[PDB]
């Protein structure tokens, strides 16, 4: 049943992993967790192993660890990060304090691709198709990613794409401040807290990404929140009375009304030389009123993706029980719940 584990110190941290994982080599960084690349001798796959930093330190961390594991165990889709394995060296709940998570090793993110390679319209078609395909899956389980940007999209040498790094923790105010890529892909309602957000925030992010694939350049590289809002409103226009009413914040609504009114720009004169179907799709995604944006399912049927669209191979997710989110528990209760999820994990099959 239980595998044999071996110990190894790598960069001032003790990795204790099953024997199946060999040639552990440190990768990236770790405020969320330390990450090693390894070779999985059971599957034959190169894998990334994450050891969680201080998982049951507070109630908020313990719940976040449970949330991450619940979410990762659910995701079973080609275009979304899947769990290969989850383990602990603990033999009981009483000595449980470390969680390790295993997934397929990724080399390149979409940021590396747009920076370093020239992309044809067919590449943009295929890349955006795959993001939307994964988003249809994610959104069908009532999961909102909340933080789609090129650095959270893993891409291989065949242009095959996966969505990673879900909005699990809140960002700090400081990492959202200034001339930063962490805010450039955020929908303005979430960036400025206009109203209760919903899954359509992710479609805004896809439009920003699509635009950057087409031009090679950030669409809204604001130097701060307000500079970024001005860049957004220059392109899409200032809001009308209908959207203004939906902005629940009185001060945010007051500030918007201080701005000089601007019409929506001609997107064919911004996205010069782009496929007219790409421009049409962008106009449907980069809509200020979140209720009027195209959804992922709607966008997959758009003519831009006619080469790739297959309605029989665009699956939806199994129902995801998210009722834990409204629940208030103790640390040892979240920890016990987390332990049950580690021990009940079944690896995905062979093909
Ligand atoms: C689940 C979520 C995240 C991770 C990580 C860190 C992110 C990553 C993913 C793939 N390759 C390299 C780095 C490693 N393993 C994980 C398991």
GROMACS .gro file of C-alpha atoms and ligand atoms in nm:
model
  368
    1UNK     CA    1   0.000   0.000   0.000
    2UNK     CA    2   0.229   0.276   0.134
    3UNK     CA    3   0.546   0.346  -0.072
    4UNK     CA    4   0.897   0.365   0.074
    5UNK     CA    5   1.012   0.727   0.119
    6UNK     CA    6   1.366   0.871   0.110
    7UNK     CA    7   1.500   1.197   0.258
    8UNK     CA    8   1.710   1.458   0.078
    9UNK     CA    9   1.810   1.818   0.167
   10UNK     CA   10   1.782   2.054  -0.136
   11UNK     CA   11   1.856   2.430  -0.087
   12UNK     CA   12   1.800   2.435   0.293
   13UNK     CA   13   1.470   2.228   0.282
   14UNK     CA   14   1.408   1.857   0.351
   15UNK     CA   15   1.228   1.674   0.067
   16UNK     CA   16   1.079   1.340   0.172
   17UNK     CA   17   0.924   1.170  -0.135
   18UNK     CA   18   0.838   0.821  -0.260
   19UNK     CA   19   1.121   0.623  -0.437
   20UNK     CA   20   0.938   0.648  -0.774
   21UNK     CA   21   1.051   1.019  -0.794
   22UNK     CA   22   1.420   1.047  -0.885
   23UNK     CA   23   1.668   1.315  -0.990
   24UNK     CA   24   1.509   1.593  -0.784
   25UNK     CA   25   1.637   1.934  -0.897
   26UNK     CA   26   1.524   2.278  -0.754
   27UNK     CA   27   1.319   2.503  -0.990
   28UNK     CA   28   1.189   2.865  -0.972
   29UNK     CA   29   1.121   2.995  -0.615
   30UNK     CA   30   0.895   2.944  -0.307
   31UNK     CA   31   0.680   3.178  -0.098
   32UNK     CA   32   0.374   2.956  -0.178
   33UNK     CA   33   0.590   2.641  -0.186
   34UNK     CA   34   0.933   2.503  -0.283
   35UNK     CA   35   0.927   2.338  -0.630
   36UNK     CA   36   1.151   2.054  -0.764
   37UNK     CA   37   1.159   1.898  -1.111
   38UNK     CA   38   1.183   1.516  -1.107
   39UNK     CA   39   1.154   1.201  -1.321
   40UNK     CA   40   0.861   0.975  -1.230
   41UNK     CA   41   0.980   0.618  -1.293
   42UNK     CA   42   0.625   0.470  -1.255
   43UNK     CA   43   0.464   0.689  -1.526
   44UNK     CA   44   0.777   0.783  -1.727
   45UNK     CA   45   0.681   1.151  -1.700
   46UNK     CA   46   0.891   1.449  -1.608
   47UNK     CA   47   0.705   1.610  -1.317
   48UNK     CA   48   0.708   1.923  -1.100
   49UNK     CA   49   0.676   1.848  -0.725
   50UNK     CA   50   0.556   2.132  -0.493
   51UNK     CA   51   0.608   2.106  -0.115
   52UNK     CA   52   0.367   2.345   0.061
   53UNK     CA   53   0.510   2.614   0.293
   54UNK     CA   54   0.346   2.597   0.638
   55UNK     CA   55   0.008   2.451   0.526
   56UNK     CA   56  -0.179   2.450   0.867
   57UNK     CA   57  -0.014   2.764   1.017
   58UNK     CA   58  -0.343   2.955   1.065
   59UNK     CA   59  -0.716   2.891   0.988
   60UNK     CA   60  -0.674   3.098   0.667
   61UNK     CA   61  -0.372   2.889   0.548
   62UNK     CA   62  -0.537   2.557   0.647
   63UNK     CA   63  -0.855   2.646   0.452
   64UNK     CA   64  -0.639   2.765   0.155
   65UNK     CA   65  -0.451   2.432   0.149
   66UNK     CA   66  -0.785   2.243   0.156
   67UNK     CA   67  -0.918   2.473  -0.124
   68UNK     CA   68  -0.612   2.416  -0.344
   69UNK     CA   69  -0.627   2.035  -0.302
   70UNK     CA   70  -1.008   2.018  -0.360
   71UNK     CA   71  -0.972   2.230  -0.674
   72UNK     CA   72  -0.673   2.035  -0.815
   73UNK     CA   73  -0.833   1.692  -0.750
   74UNK     CA   74  -1.141   1.809  -0.947
   75UNK     CA   75  -0.967   1.932  -1.267
   76UNK     CA   76  -0.965   1.656  -1.533
   77UNK     CA   77  -0.926   1.835  -1.867
   78UNK     CA   78  -0.652   1.852  -2.145
   79UNK     CA   79  -0.626   2.235  -2.119
   80UNK     CA   80  -0.618   2.260  -1.735
   81UNK     CA   81  -0.352   2.156  -1.481
   82UNK     CA   82  -0.421   1.802  -1.341
   83UNK     CA   83  -0.292   1.627  -1.025
   84UNK     CA   84  -0.066   1.331  -1.095
   85UNK     CA   85  -0.009   1.259  -0.725
   86UNK     CA   86  -0.050   1.402  -0.376
   87UNK     CA   87   0.140   1.256  -0.079
   88UNK     CA   88   0.256   1.308   0.275
   89UNK     CA   89   0.535   1.114   0.457
   90UNK     CA   90   0.302   1.110   0.765
   91UNK     CA   91   0.166   0.765   0.864
   92UNK     CA   92  -0.119   0.919   1.071
   93UNK     CA   93  -0.326   1.240   1.110
   94UNK     CA   94  -0.143   1.318   1.438
   95UNK     CA   95   0.202   1.351   1.264
   96UNK     CA   96   0.048   1.509   0.942
   97UNK     CA   97   0.209   1.850   0.861
   98UNK     CA   98   0.356   1.838   0.501
   99UNK     CA   99   0.167   1.809   0.172
  100UNK     CA  100   0.342   1.749  -0.160
  101UNK     CA  101   0.165   1.799  -0.496
  102UNK     CA  102   0.275   1.645  -0.830
  103UNK     CA  103   0.181   1.758  -1.186
  104UNK     CA  104   0.339   1.744  -1.537
  105UNK     CA  105   0.661   1.952  -1.566
  106UNK     CA  106   0.609   2.273  -1.775
  107UNK     CA  107   0.894   2.453  -1.955
  108UNK     CA  108   0.751   2.751  -2.136
  109UNK     CA  109   0.465   2.984  -2.045
  110UNK     CA  110   0.273   3.198  -2.296
  111UNK     CA  111   0.477   3.503  -2.186
  112UNK     CA  112   0.792   3.325  -2.322
  113UNK     CA  113   0.611   3.244  -2.653
  114UNK     CA  114   0.481   3.599  -2.732
  115UNK     CA  115   0.815   3.754  -2.623
  116UNK     CA  116   1.044   3.513  -2.816
  117UNK     CA  117   0.848   3.380  -3.123
  118UNK     CA  118   0.660   3.531  -3.419
  119UNK     CA  119   0.296   3.407  -3.406
  120UNK     CA  120   0.078   3.360  -3.718
  121UNK     CA  121  -0.302   3.405  -3.706
  122UNK     CA  122  -0.333   3.022  -3.704
  123UNK     CA  123  -0.120   3.009  -3.386
  124UNK     CA  124  -0.341   3.274  -3.219
  125UNK     CA  125  -0.653   3.079  -3.328
  126UNK     CA  126  -0.515   2.759  -3.173
  127UNK     CA  127  -0.383   2.920  -2.853
  128UNK     CA  128  -0.701   3.117  -2.775
  129UNK     CA  129  -0.921   2.817  -2.871
  130UNK     CA  130  -0.746   2.610  -2.602
  131UNK     CA  131  -0.781   2.879  -2.329
  132UNK     CA  132  -1.156   2.903  -2.410
  133UNK     CA  133  -1.186   2.523  -2.417
  134UNK     CA  134  -1.037   2.501  -2.066
  135UNK     CA  135  -1.245   2.800  -1.949
  136UNK     CA  136  -1.572   2.639  -2.069
  137UNK     CA  137  -1.473   2.339  -1.853
  138UNK     CA  138  -1.374   2.553  -1.547
  139UNK     CA  139  -1.681   2.782  -1.573
  140UNK     CA  140  -1.922   2.479  -1.602
  141UNK     CA  141  -1.812   2.383  -1.246
  142UNK     CA  142  -1.885   2.744  -1.124
  143UNK     CA  143  -1.508   2.803  -1.072
  144UNK     CA  144  -1.373   3.152  -1.156
  145UNK     CA  145  -0.997   3.154  -1.225
  146UNK     CA  146  -0.972   3.531  -1.150
  147UNK     CA  147  -0.599   3.571  -1.250
  148UNK     CA  148  -0.557   3.467  -1.616
  149UNK     CA  149  -0.244   3.616  -1.765
  150UNK     CA  150   0.031   3.481  -1.999
  151UNK     CA  151   0.255   3.361  -1.707
  152UNK     CA  152  -0.029   3.123  -1.584
  153UNK     CA  153  -0.064   2.953  -1.927
  154UNK     CA  154   0.185   2.666  -1.992
  155UNK     CA  155   0.260   2.601  -2.364
  156UNK     CA  156   0.470   2.312  -2.514
  157UNK     CA  157   0.669   2.286  -2.841
  158UNK     CA  158   0.353   2.166  -3.029
  159UNK     CA  159   0.162   2.487  -2.913
  160UNK     CA  160  -0.053   2.273  -2.672
  161UNK     CA  161  -0.175   2.490  -2.383
  162UNK     CA  162  -0.273   2.438  -2.013
  163UNK     CA  163  -0.429   2.678  -1.758
  164UNK     CA  164  -0.235   2.684  -1.426
  165UNK     CA  165  -0.222   2.886  -1.104
  166UNK     CA  166  -0.582   2.946  -1.010
  167UNK     CA  167  -0.693   3.244  -0.796
  168UNK     CA  168  -0.658   3.056  -0.464
  169UNK     CA  169  -0.511   3.333  -0.242
  170UNK     CA  170  -0.598   3.703  -0.251
  171UNK     CA  171  -0.307   3.912  -0.389
  172UNK     CA  172  -0.160   4.180  -0.163
  173UNK     CA  173  -0.234   4.545  -0.246
  174UNK     CA  174   0.141   4.604  -0.308
  175UNK     CA  175   0.179   4.339  -0.582
  176UNK     CA  176  -0.124   4.497  -0.760
  177UNK     CA  177   0.038   4.847  -0.739
  178UNK     CA  178   0.225   5.031  -1.015
  179UNK     CA  179   0.353   4.926  -1.359
  180UNK     CA  180   0.286   4.552  -1.300
  181UNK     CA  181   0.168   4.259  -1.515
  182UNK     CA  182  -0.026   4.124  -1.215
  183UNK     CA  183  -0.302   4.389  -1.286
  184UNK     CA  184  -0.284   4.448  -1.669
  185UNK     CA  185  -0.516   4.151  -1.750
  186UNK     CA  186  -0.777   4.223  -1.474
  187UNK     CA  187  -1.133   4.328  -1.563
  188UNK     CA  188  -1.203   4.684  -1.448
  189UNK     CA  189  -1.490   4.579  -1.213
  190UNK     CA  190  -1.253   4.352  -1.016
  191UNK     CA  191  -0.958   4.599  -1.041
  192UNK     CA  192  -1.165   4.890  -0.901
  193UNK     CA  193  -1.426   4.687  -0.695
  194UNK     CA  194  -1.734   4.820  -0.882
  195UNK     CA  195  -1.969   4.530  -0.800
  196UNK     CA  196  -1.991   4.159  -0.720
  197UNK     CA  197  -1.774   3.999  -0.991
  198UNK     CA  198  -1.856   3.678  -1.181
  199UNK     CA  199  -1.690   3.431  -1.429
  200UNK     CA  200  -1.702   3.676  -1.718
  201UNK     CA  201  -1.398   3.851  -1.554
  202UNK     CA  202  -1.192   3.568  -1.711
  203UNK     CA  203  -1.326   3.654  -2.062
  204UNK     CA  204  -1.189   4.012  -2.022
  205UNK     CA  205  -0.847   3.858  -1.941
  206UNK     CA  206  -0.866   3.636  -2.254
  207UNK     CA  207  -0.932   3.947  -2.468
  208UNK     CA  208  -0.625   4.121  -2.322
  209UNK     CA  209  -0.419   3.805  -2.393
  210UNK     CA  210  -0.559   3.765  -2.746
  211UNK     CA  211  -0.479   4.130  -2.824
  212UNK     CA  212  -0.120   4.084  -2.704
  213UNK     CA  213  -0.081   3.767  -2.920
  214UNK     CA  214  -0.202   3.964  -3.227
  215UNK     CA  215   0.017   4.277  -3.168
  216UNK     CA  216   0.305   4.141  -2.954
  217UNK     CA  217   0.232   4.422  -2.700
  218UNK     CA  218   0.040   4.463  -2.375
  219UNK     CA  219  -0.306   4.602  -2.446
  220UNK     CA  220  -0.349   4.797  -2.114
  221UNK     CA  221  -0.002   4.843  -1.953
  222UNK     CA  222  -0.120   5.100  -1.696
  223UNK     CA  223   0.130   5.267  -1.460
  224UNK     CA  224  -0.135   5.241  -1.184
  225UNK     CA  225  -0.509   5.154  -1.140
  226UNK     CA  226  -0.635   5.492  -1.270
  227UNK     CA  227  -0.391   5.519  -1.561
  228UNK     CA  228  -0.505   5.164  -1.660
  229UNK     CA  229  -0.873   5.259  -1.634
  230UNK     CA  230  -0.806   5.556  -1.867
  231UNK     CA  231  -0.638   5.324  -2.120
  232UNK     CA  232  -0.940   5.087  -2.100
  233UNK     CA  233  -1.200   5.365  -2.138
  234UNK     CA  234  -1.010   5.518  -2.434
  235UNK     CA  235  -1.057   5.187  -2.626
  236UNK     CA  236  -1.405   5.067  -2.515
  237UNK     CA  237  -1.565   5.405  -2.429
  238UNK     CA  238  -1.690   5.553  -2.101
  239UNK     CA  239  -1.992   5.375  -1.947
  240UNK     CA  240  -2.355   5.459  -2.026
  241UNK     CA  241  -2.635   5.505  -1.771
  242UNK     CA  242  -2.729   5.135  -1.781
  243UNK     CA  243  -2.383   5.014  -1.662
  244UNK     CA  244  -2.345   5.307  -1.415
  245UNK     CA  245  -2.661   5.190  -1.229
  246UNK     CA  246  -2.500   4.844  -1.185
  247UNK     CA  247  -2.189   4.996  -1.014
  248UNK     CA  248  -2.282   4.943  -0.644
  249UNK     CA  249  -1.994   5.158  -0.510
  250UNK     CA  250  -2.111   5.522  -0.481
  251UNK     CA  251  -1.757   5.670  -0.488
  252UNK     CA  252  -1.653   5.454  -0.790
  253UNK     CA  253  -1.974   5.567  -0.966
  254UNK     CA  254  -1.901   5.931  -0.867
  255UNK     CA  255  -1.543   5.909  -1.000
  256UNK     CA  256  -1.659   5.762  -1.338
  257UNK     CA  257  -1.901   6.054  -1.390
  258UNK     CA  258  -1.611   6.303  -1.343
  259UNK     CA  259  -1.448   6.172  -1.668
  260UNK     CA  260  -1.512   6.331  -2.008
  261UNK     CA  261  -1.729   6.098  -2.216
  262UNK     CA  262  -1.550   5.901  -2.494
  263UNK     CA  263  -1.694   5.675  -2.767
  264UNK     CA  264  -1.579   5.316  -2.830
  265UNK     CA  265  -1.285   5.320  -3.078
  266UNK     CA  266  -1.281   5.151  -3.416
  267UNK     CA  267  -1.103   4.819  -3.332
  268UNK     CA  268  -0.994   4.770  -3.699
  269UNK     CA  269  -0.788   5.093  -3.666
  270UNK     CA  270  -0.632   4.967  -3.336
  271UNK     CA  271  -0.570   4.605  -3.451
  272UNK     CA  272  -0.438   4.704  -3.798
  273UNK     CA  273  -0.397   4.407  -4.037
  274UNK     CA  274  -0.567   4.156  -3.805
  275UNK     CA  275  -0.813   3.896  -3.931
  276UNK     CA  276  -1.160   4.073  -3.923
  277UNK     CA  277  -1.299   3.768  -3.733
  278UNK     CA  278  -1.030   3.819  -3.461
  279UNK     CA  279  -1.132   4.188  -3.436
  280UNK     CA  280  -1.502   4.089  -3.416
  281UNK     CA  281  -1.427   3.841  -3.136
  282UNK     CA  282  -1.221   4.106  -2.944
  283UNK     CA  283  -1.516   4.350  -2.962
  284UNK     CA  284  -1.734   4.076  -2.800
  285UNK     CA  285  -1.482   4.006  -2.515
  286UNK     CA  286  -1.367   4.364  -2.435
  287UNK     CA  287  -1.712   4.489  -2.333
  288UNK     CA  288  -1.724   4.702  -2.018
  289UNK     CA  289  -2.064   4.569  -1.895
  290UNK     CA  290  -1.981   4.220  -1.766
  291UNK     CA  291  -2.345   4.098  -1.833
  292UNK     CA  292  -2.296   4.162  -2.213
  293UNK     CA  293  -1.959   3.988  -2.268
  294UNK     CA  294  -1.944   3.667  -2.468
  295UNK     CA  295  -1.906   3.351  -2.254
  296UNK     CA  296  -1.648   3.075  -2.322
  297UNK     CA  297  -1.914   2.840  -2.469
  298UNK     CA  298  -2.046   3.117  -2.698
  299UNK     CA  299  -1.691   3.212  -2.803
  300UNK     CA  300  -1.601   2.851  -2.903
  301UNK     CA  301  -1.877   2.864  -3.169
  302UNK     CA  302  -1.745   3.197  -3.315
  303UNK     CA  303  -1.627   3.171  -3.683
  304UNK     CA  304  -1.264   3.263  -3.586
  305UNK     CA  305  -1.223   2.909  -3.444
  306UNK     CA  306  -1.386   2.724  -3.744
  307UNK     CA  307  -1.064   2.521  -3.804
  308UNK     CA  308  -1.064   2.384  -3.441
  309UNK     CA  309  -1.427   2.390  -3.313
  310UNK     CA  310  -1.565   2.042  -3.241
  311UNK     CA  311  -1.880   2.054  -3.018
  312UNK     CA  312  -1.841   1.679  -2.939
  313UNK     CA  313  -1.488   1.738  -2.792
  314UNK     CA  314  -1.545   2.047  -2.576
  315UNK     CA  315  -1.640   1.883  -2.245
  316UNK     CA  316  -1.793   2.027  -1.927
  317UNK     CA  317  -1.687   1.946  -1.571
  318UNK     CA  318  -1.851   1.718  -1.313
  319UNK     CA  319  -2.037   1.916  -1.040
  320UNK     CA  320  -1.800   2.080  -0.792
  321UNK     CA  321  -1.920   2.109  -0.429
  322UNK     CA  322  -1.794   2.450  -0.308
  323UNK     CA  323  -2.006   2.468   0.014
  324UNK     CA  324  -1.690   2.454   0.232
  325UNK     CA  325  -1.620   2.816   0.122
  326UNK     CA  326  -1.902   2.956   0.344
  327UNK     CA  327  -1.808   2.725   0.635
  328UNK     CA  328  -1.606   2.838   0.942
  329UNK     CA  329  -1.392   2.562   1.100
  330UNK     CA  330  -1.090   2.518   1.329
  331UNK     CA  331  -0.735   2.449   1.200
  332UNK     CA  332  -0.742   2.080   1.300
  333UNK     CA  333  -1.083   2.041   1.127
  334UNK     CA  334  -0.942   2.184   0.795
  335UNK     CA  335  -0.630   1.971   0.846
  336UNK     CA  336  -0.839   1.654   0.900
  337UNK     CA  337  -1.046   1.732   0.587
  338UNK     CA  338  -0.717   1.790   0.397
  339UNK     CA  339  -0.576   1.452   0.523
  340UNK     CA  340  -0.890   1.264   0.404
  341UNK     CA  341  -0.838   1.419   0.055
  342UNK     CA  342  -0.467   1.314   0.042
  343UNK     CA  343  -0.539   0.951   0.145
  344UNK     CA  344  -0.850   0.917  -0.082
  345UNK     CA  345  -0.659   1.036  -0.396
  346UNK     CA  346  -0.667   0.792  -0.692
  347UNK     CA  347  -0.415   0.864  -0.976
  348UNK     CA  348  -0.542   0.924  -1.331
  349UNK     CA  349  -0.539   0.630  -1.579
  350UNK     CA  350  -0.311   0.508  -1.864
  351UNK     CA  351  -0.380   0.573  -2.238
  352LIG     C1  352  -0.010   2.149  -0.834
  352LIG     C2  353  -0.010   2.287  -0.855
  352LIG     C3  354   0.107   2.355  -0.881
  352LIG     C4  355   0.228   2.285  -0.887
  352LIG     C5  356   0.368   2.323  -0.912
  352LIG     C6  357   0.424   2.462  -0.939
  352LIG     C7  358   0.387   2.516  -1.077
  352LIG     C8  359   0.449   2.434  -1.188
  352LIG     C9  360   0.371   2.349  -1.264
  352LIG    C10  361   0.430   2.273  -1.364
  352LIG     N1  362   0.560   2.280  -1.390
  352LIG    C11  363   0.637   2.361  -1.319
  352LIG    C12  364   0.586   2.440  -1.216
  352LIG    C13  365   0.440   2.209  -0.904
  352LIG     N2  366   0.357   2.103  -0.877
  352LIG    C14  367   0.227   2.145  -0.866
  352LIG    C15  368   0.108   2.076  -0.840
   0.00000   0.00000   0.00000
